[PDB]
Design an enzyme around this catalytic site. Structure first.
Site, PDB file in Angstrom:
ATOM      1  N   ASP A 115      82.799  46.884  47.335  1.00 31.26           N
ATOM      2  CA  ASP A 115      83.358  46.445  48.607  1.00 31.26           C
ATOM      3  C   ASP A 115      82.989  47.355  49.759  1.00 31.26           C
ATOM      4  O   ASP A 115      83.628  48.386  50.014  1.00 31.26           O
ATOM      5  CB  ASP A 115      84.867  46.374  48.475  1.00 31.26           C
ATOM      6  CG  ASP A 115      85.573  45.722  49.612  1.00 31.26           C
ATOM      7  OD1 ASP A 115      84.880  45.474  50.640  1.00 31.26           O
ATOM      8  OD2 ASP A 115      86.796  45.455  49.473  1.00 31.26           O
ATOM      9  N   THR A 116      81.937  46.976  50.505  1.00 31.77           N
ATOM     10  CA  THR A 116      81.465  47.831  51.560  1.00 31.77           C
ATOM     11  C   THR A 116      82.393  47.865  52.755  1.00 31.77           C
ATOM     12  O   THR A 116      82.284  48.746  53.591  1.00 31.77           O
ATOM     13  CB  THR A 116      80.066  47.389  52.047  1.00 31.77           C
ATOM     14  OG1 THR A 116      80.092  46.035  52.475  1.00 31.77           O
ATOM     15  CG2 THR A 116      79.026  47.528  50.945  1.00 31.77           C
ATOM     16  N   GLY A 117      83.314  46.911  52.838  1.00 29.24           N
ATOM     17  CA  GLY A 117      84.337  46.905  53.860  1.00 29.24           C
ATOM     18  C   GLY A 117      85.575  47.687  53.525  1.00 29.24           C
ATOM     19  O   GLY A 117      86.542  47.684  54.315  1.00 29.24           O
TER      20      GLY A 117
HETATM   21  C1  LIG Z   1      88.523  34.714  51.799  1.00 26.42           C
HETATM   22  O1  LIG Z   1      87.884  35.555  52.736  1.00 26.42           O
HETATM   23  C2  LIG Z   1      88.432  36.799  52.837  1.00 26.42           C
HETATM   24  C3  LIG Z   1      89.596  37.185  52.150  1.00 26.42           C
HETATM   25  C4  LIG Z   1      90.089  38.478  52.341  1.00 26.42           C
HETATM   26  C5  LIG Z   1      89.408  39.407  53.118  1.00 26.42           C
HETATM   27  S1  LIG Z   1      89.927  41.090  53.186  1.00 26.42           S
HETATM   28  O2  LIG Z   1      89.623  41.643  54.520  1.00 26.42           O
HETATM   29  O3  LIG Z   1      91.314  41.129  52.659  1.00 26.42           O
HETATM   30  N1  LIG Z   1      89.067  41.971  52.098  1.00 26.42           N
HETATM   31  C6  LIG Z   1      89.065  41.474  50.743  1.00 26.42           C
HETATM   32  C7  LIG Z   1      88.685  42.503  49.688  1.00 26.42           C
HETATM   33  C8  LIG Z   1      89.816  43.485  49.414  1.00 26.42           C
HETATM   34  C9  LIG Z   1      90.600  42.796  48.276  1.00 26.42           C
HETATM   35  C10 LIG Z   1      89.600  41.836  47.680  1.00 26.42           C
HETATM   36  O4  LIG Z   1      89.735  41.177  46.669  1.00 26.42           O
HETATM   37  N2  LIG Z   1      88.510  41.811  48.406  1.00 26.42           N
HETATM   38  C11 LIG Z   1      87.837  42.544  52.592  1.00 26.42           C
HETATM   39  C12 LIG Z   1      87.889  44.067  52.474  1.00 26.42           C
HETATM   40  O5  LIG Z   1      86.557  44.589  52.636  1.00 26.42           O
HETATM   41  C13 LIG Z   1      88.805  44.682  53.530  1.00 26.42           C
HETATM   42  C14 LIG Z   1      88.271  44.542  54.945  1.00 26.42           C
HETATM   43  C15 LIG Z   1      89.277  45.117  55.947  1.00 26.42           C
HETATM   44  C16 LIG Z   1      90.460  44.496  56.219  1.00 26.42           C
HETATM   45  C17 LIG Z   1      91.362  45.089  57.115  1.00 26.42           C
HETATM   46  C18 LIG Z   1      91.049  46.297  57.725  1.00 26.42           C
HETATM   47  C19 LIG Z   1      89.858  46.957  57.462  1.00 26.42           C
HETATM   48  C20 LIG Z   1      88.980  46.331  56.581  1.00 26.42           C
HETATM   49  N3  LIG Z   1      88.989  46.095  53.247  1.00 26.42           N
HETATM   50  C21 LIG Z   1      90.077  46.623  52.723  1.00 26.42           C
HETATM   51  O6  LIG Z   1      91.088  45.950  52.397  1.00 26.42           O
HETATM   52  O7  LIG Z   1      90.018  47.980  52.553  1.00 26.42           O
HETATM   53  C22 LIG Z   1      91.282  48.568  52.196  1.00 26.42           C
HETATM   54  C23 LIG Z   1      92.205  48.664  53.400  1.00 26.42           C
HETATM   55  C24 LIG Z   1      91.892  49.974  54.104  1.00 26.42           C
HETATM   56  C25 LIG Z   1      91.198  49.808  55.462  1.00 26.42           C
HETATM   57  C26 LIG Z   1      89.728  49.823  55.110  1.00 26.42           C
HETATM   58  O8  LIG Z   1      89.616  50.531  53.890  1.00 26.42           O
HETATM   59  C27 LIG Z   1      90.883  50.727  53.252  1.00 26.42           C
HETATM   60  C28 LIG Z   1      90.917  50.043  51.878  1.00 26.42           C
HETATM   61  C29 LIG Z   1      88.281  39.001  53.815  1.00 26.42           C
HETATM   62  C30 LIG Z   1      87.832  37.684  53.723  1.00 26.42           C
END
Ligand SMILES: COc1ccc(S(=O)(=O)N(C[C@H]2CCC(=O)N2)C[C@@H](O)[C@H](Cc2ccccc2)NC(=O)O[C@@H]2C[C@@H]3CCO[C@@H]3C2)cc1
Ligand SMILES: [Cl-]
Ligand SMILES: [Cl-]
Ligand code: NA
EC number: 3.4.23.16
Lengths: 99, 99
Positions: free
Chosen positions: A25-27
């Site tokens: 997960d690059t995000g």
């Molecule tokens: C159906 O389409 C989507 C569903 C959910 C998301 S998401 O943003 O919840 N997420 C899903 C990931 C996490 C759970 C999973 O099964 N896959 C994308 C992530 O890249 C998300 C992207 C993201 C969402 C909100 C803020 C910042 C990044 N990052 C994230 O949750 O990182 C966690 C929170 C903390 C902030 C960043 O790093 C720390 C760890 C995006 C599109």
């Protein structure tokens, strides 16, 4: 490897001698795994995802294999829909995004 | 390009005539953009992650320019904390994860 993104980039990880599935997960800044027992002390941390902030347990210096590559670093334990491998460990295994 | 993951993989995008910064996110199934107007029809959707779910508007057949590469697909619009380019559009620009 070269992983395309038509499917979720799920890999096998090994932590505490157990095999699990996790999403590359690059995000994600951080690695977040579902409740399990890990050794040592933990510290508190709040992380903010798409739905809001949650509390997790931060364990440092944990040995984790990711797709056959050895990493040692921080693992956050708490309620996540799926185990996610974030940039803190993606960097350790040498991952890059390419296009 | 080859993008390392020491820092968040942010790029410039153009959507709806607007320039924005967005995260290249292999852990996101779908593309999610902060509240803005898009033309055409939409339908409601719920998406979930860490912290729970948010309600979004689903717009189909939307063109996005991503780091200078044009793609078309579904874009979700809602109260996400960050703009997210997910796998549905990463595939179209030929993005891969390499290690
Ligand atoms: C159906 O389409 C989507 C569903 C959910 C998301 S998401 O943003 O919840 N997420 C899903 C990931 C996490 C759970 C999973 O099964 N896959 C994308 C992530 O890249 C998300 C992207 C993201 C969402 C909100 C803020 C910042 C990044 N990052 C994230 O949750 O990182 C966690 C929170 C903390 C902030 C960043 O790093 C720390 C760890 C995006 C599109
Ligand atoms: Cl799509
Ligand atoms: Cl391909
Ligand atoms: Na449309």
């Amino acid at each position: 490897p070269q992983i395309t993104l038509w499917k979720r980039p799920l890999v096998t990880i090994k932590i505490g001698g157990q095999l699990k599935e996790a999403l590359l997960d690059t995000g994600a800044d951080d690695t977040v795994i579902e409740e399990m027992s890990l050794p040592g002390r933990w510290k508190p941390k709040m992380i903010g995802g798409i739905g809001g902030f949650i509390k997790v347990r931060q364990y440092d210096q944990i040995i984790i294999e990711i797709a056959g590559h050895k990493a040692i670093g921080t693992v956050l334990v708490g309620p996540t829909p799926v185990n996610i491998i974030g940039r803190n460990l993606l960097t350790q295994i040498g991952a890059t995004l390419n296009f």
